[PDB]
């Protein structure tokens, strides 16, 4: 051979980066950015796997040159449930815990979570213990794509259910004495639900911007405060009724599992007692009449942490979560900054 050998060139690193982008972000983009394939049969039901699997998305929407040099979440994905993804380690693990096949004979142990009895020490006697279990696959099962499992053939059957109980082999004289003490009302047991809250859900019509709520005159003694988020109706099953006919979704359910992800869509909150008295009032906040969560350019001066959050809101959240704020701002101690805490999940971007 005279000259150099025959060679073909390929950019390895660029390819790997690209494949990562298309697989993890592109394909999960909102359906409005996709289009149906030509000459291929595709289902009419958008809650179908076939539909979510055949709708085609252009790689150029999230290519390797997308927002180069930046740490930025795509505006299109901010409001897309991040947990309904194949890289959700928790879901992936529970999926493999059952096996890698479609047909699975399962055997599981289910815990009692009701606060009034979960840690109760039950004394001698005979008790009727009865409970109800769901069979609706959209409720008991979870998918990473979130397709309608009722339509997509998922099925479940309960063959047998037993109740197990373990007893400390306590000395009989001691158990007997402990029983006597615990039967006096002075030594009654007591528990409180950890969440400790009355849960309300108010509808926000598509494109609605203002959400006013009203609580008729009542007693507020012992009131502890407010906590709130925003959920998608499609991802929130109707509870109370034993079966929700219009529930055609099987992804994460923020309302029940805590996979909240829409906190960034709140603008401000105004609180008013007896339709005239503003709370907290007293000219406490920089914008005294309301809680401004974020501002748009016009009021940059009142923002902090290098993002659109206001100084007022950052201060309140830091105090509410860690009591940090009146004597300087600093990273809270790890043991107080848990998984569902404010700081741990705060991500400013530009």
């Amino acid at each position: 051979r005279v000259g150099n050998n025959f060679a073909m060139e390929i950019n390895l690193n660029a390819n790997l980066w690209r494949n990562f982008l298309y697989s993890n972000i592109a394909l999960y983009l909102p359906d409005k950015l996709k289009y149906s394939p030509s000459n291929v049969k595709i289902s009419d039901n958008p809650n179908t796997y076939d539909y979510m699997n055949k709708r085609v998305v252009a790689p150029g929407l999230v290519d390797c040159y997308i927002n180069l040099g930046a740490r930025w979440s795509l505006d299109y994905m901010d409001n897309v449930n991040p947990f309904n993804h194949h890289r959700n380690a928790g879901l992936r693990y529970r999926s493999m815990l059952l096996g890698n096949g479609r047909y699975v004979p399962f055997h599981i142990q289910v815990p009692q979570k009701f606060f009034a009895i979960k840690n109760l020490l039950l004394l001698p006697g005979s008790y009727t213990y009865e409970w109800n279990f769901r069979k609706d696959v959209n409720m008991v099962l979870q998918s990473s794509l979130g397709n309608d499992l009722r339509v997509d053939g998922a099925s479940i059957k309960f063959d047998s259910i037993c109740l197990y109980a373990t007893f400390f082999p306590m000395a009989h004289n001691t158990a007997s004495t402990l029983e006597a003490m615990l039967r006096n009302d002075t030594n009654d047991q007591s528990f409180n639900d950890y969440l400790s809250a009355a849960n309300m859900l108010y509808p926000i019509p598509a494109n609605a911007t203002n959400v006013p709520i009203s609580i008729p005159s009542r007693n507020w003694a012992a009131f502890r405060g407010w906590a709130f988020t925003r959920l998608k109706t499609k991802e929130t099953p109707s509870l109370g009724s034993g079966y929700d006919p219009y529930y055609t979704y099987s992804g994460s359910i923020p309302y029940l599992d805590g996979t909240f992800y829409l906190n960034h869509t709140f603008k401000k909150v105004a609180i008013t007692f007896d339709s005239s008295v503003s709370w907290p009032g007293n000219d406490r906040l920089l914008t005294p009449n309301e809680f401004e969560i974020k501002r748009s350019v016009d009021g940059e001066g009142y923002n902090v942490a290098q993002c659109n959050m206001t100084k007022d809101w950052f201060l309140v959240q830091m105090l509410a979560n860690y009591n940090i704020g009146y004597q300087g701002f600093y990273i809270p101690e790890s043991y107080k900054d848990r998984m569902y805490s404010f700081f741990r999940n705060f991500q400013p971007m530009s």
Partner: protein, 354 residues
Amino acid sequence: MMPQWSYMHISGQDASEYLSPGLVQFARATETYFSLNNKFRNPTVAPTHDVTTDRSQRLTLRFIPVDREDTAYSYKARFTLAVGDNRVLDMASTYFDIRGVLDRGPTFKPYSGTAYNALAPKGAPNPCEWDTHVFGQAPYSGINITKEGIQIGVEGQTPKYADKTFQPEPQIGESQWYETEINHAAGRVLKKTTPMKPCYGSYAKPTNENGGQGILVLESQVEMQFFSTTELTPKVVLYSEDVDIETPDTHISYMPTIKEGNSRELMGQQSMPNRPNYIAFRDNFIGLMYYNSTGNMGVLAGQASQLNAVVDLQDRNTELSYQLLLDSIGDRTRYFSMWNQAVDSYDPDVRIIE
């Protein structure tokens, strides 16, 4: 017993008691810059009375439903939880043991990519035929070719021919990299009656212990097709056949023509792996049990009281309360299979692109 135990400090007093007061004072005063603590044993003795029972007693009891009601969308089970005399039960150690059958359905795909011919270019077709033209490959190099087919050897002085049902095997080919020029080649091809599909993702169940996939009707239907160069012994032999071809985990990413039937056009179709889709029970078995639903309220009552100690409101949120409780008393990043305790999460690099 006693004697040796006390002397060797297996039992008895603590160092702070058996050491002279002077040394104890000294040890405390120097602890910070010169420690003597690890030089003297401090015994630990378990209590011997009033803790555990000497009597026969089960540690774990199992209760069977006294009544069960498998209904349209729910299951109801009733038990008679009995706590014996001289016993106490911590409800936290109770749980419902459930056995059943689950079908995740056909949309369940626990992985990305394909399980079949993943290394094949996504547009490369399988050796095929259409209307009649042939597009194939003959990788096996045999001794000679006769009306008997390709010769794979000679048992003694007699010629041994390939077994139509599985030979030649697609897996086998020439060993060296340079072209040595094969004169008698063989290979397998798909009859025009088998629909064309890209190699990538192609699967067909085997019909014999040797890996052949030819459809049986019960005898093999393989038909040899001989070819010679356009210029008279045959140079190539193709074993055409029909296979139960299917593409269980991929779909067509590019359909050239809407027209049905195999044609030259279909050779340009491309395959793509189906989207991954994990299906499983929820974190901490959320949703399995009814909570905060007055229509399906749980029951815990003394048979002698008949009064239900459980009083729920659809205004309460038990599942979320439990999610937040666990986060406060432990490391929610750790997994525990028993309770299906594996929290939902996402890849940070996917949520926020860097």
